[PDB]
């Protein structure tokens, strides 16, 4: 089998991407944030505290003839941005772009933190990291990809995120029309539960490539590119007036600037992020200070190849017995 679904930016900055997902019988369609940095499929629901729902579409398990309470199971998750959610668990039928999994754990939110409530466009998350990170207790549950894998034509999914435009998540096949050149594959460590890999270096604009190993995660659920402070300083030093602002929480730059590109290495290959992809707009409405799309990871504990980096590439998440990542230009 295969599936193919369009993913759409939630706003004009590409802060996140939503993909329609069918849950239950009859189908209830929710727009979920596909997140290769986590491993829970959770949704706003008829059980979510009413004051914490503000415009989202909810899953109502009592209206699904295929929903079953997973008795005794609970879940609770905290994300790297300080947001969180928790609740109980149903199993139900879940379909993405024509690909169907029966018995998928659908984690129903009883509580969500304020940042979820405040984002009316995201109805939940669909985790695509390794199932070892899934938070369901006392019986850990599998991701949608893990459940579908054996049925797929090939045990892969691909992320093709657009810049200020829709893109595609495909399951079970590699669309050879969706990229240019060849796909360069690179090794993955699953030891932390992530799609963790090592970039071979970077360049800033037209500058020379610096060969240096940068371990990080391919994370569609993170907006920006988080890299070591040395790398990030070298980038922003090429932008007149850019500075790190403790009060804003990262590098800012004059909105009048034209930003240089940023290149990252995948083996001997190179992915070029155009400068425009690094502009996240005014820090507050009407400001002439703009927020940078490349930020320091120094306070995270891990480097994160988020949407800023991934949207410059066609990315293969290869879930073969030994997982690997592939990157192609597009």
UniProtKB/Swiss-Prot annotation:
The active site is at residues 35, 199. Keywords: Aspartyl protease, Disulfide bond, Hydrolase, Protease, Signal, Zymogen. Disulfide bonds join 255-290. GO terms for molecular function: aspartic-type endopeptidase activity. It catalyses: Hydrolysis of proteins with specificity similar to that of pepsin A, prefers hydrophobic residues at P1 and P1', but does not cleave 14-Ala-|-Leu-15 in the B chain of insulin or Z-Glu-Tyr. Clots milk. GO terms for biological process: proteolysis. The keyword Metal-binding does not apply. Its EC number is 3.4.23.22. Residues 17-328 form the Peptidase A1 domain. Belongs to the peptidase A1 family. This is Endothiapepsin. It comes from Cryphonectria parasitica. The gene is EAPA. The chain holds residues 90 to 419 of 419 of the full protein.
């Amino acid at each position: 089998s295969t599936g193919s679904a369009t993913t759409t930016p939630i706003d004009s900055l590409d802060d996140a991407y939503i993909t329609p997902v069918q849950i239950g019988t009859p189908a209830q369609t929710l727009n979920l944030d596909f997140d290769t940095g986590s491993s829970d499929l959770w949704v706003f629901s008829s059980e979510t505290t009413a004051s914490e729902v503000d415009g989202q579409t909810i899953y109502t398990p009592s209206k699904s003839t295929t929903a079953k309470l997973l008795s005794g199971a609970t879940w609770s998750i905290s994300y790297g941005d300080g947001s969180s959610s928790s609740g109980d668990v149903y199993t139900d039928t879940v379909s993405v772009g024509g690909l169907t999994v029966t018995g998928q754990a659908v984690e129903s939110a009883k509580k969500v933190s304020s940042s979820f409530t405040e984002d009316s466009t995201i109805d939940g998350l669909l985790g695509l990291a390794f199932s070892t990170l899934n938070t369901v207790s006392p019986t850990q549950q599998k991701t949608f990809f893990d459940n579908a894998k054996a049925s797929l034509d090939s045990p892969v999914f691909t992320a093709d995120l657009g810049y200020h435009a829709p893109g595609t998540y495909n399951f079970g096949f590699i669309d050879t029309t969706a990229y240019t050149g060849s796909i360069t594959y690179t090794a993955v460590s699953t030891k932390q539960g992530f799609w963790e890999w090592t970039s071979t270096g970077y360049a800033v604009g037209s500058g020379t490539f610096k060969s240096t190993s940068i371990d990080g995660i391919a994370d569609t659920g993170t907006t920006l590119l988080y890299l070591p402070a040395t790398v990030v300083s070298a980038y922003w030093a090429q932008v007149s007036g850019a500075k790190s602002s403790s009060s804003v929480g990262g590098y800012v730059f004059p909105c009048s600037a034209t930003l240089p590109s940023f290149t990252f290495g995948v083996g001997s290959a190179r992915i070029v992020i155009p400068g425009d992809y690094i502009d996240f707009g005014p820090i507050s409405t009407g400001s002439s200070s703009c927020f940078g799309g490349i930020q320091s990871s120094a306070g995270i504990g891990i480097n994160i190849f988020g949407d800023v980096a991934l949207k410059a590439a066609f990315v293969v998440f290869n879930g073969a017995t030994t997982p690997t990542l592939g990157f192609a230009s597009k």
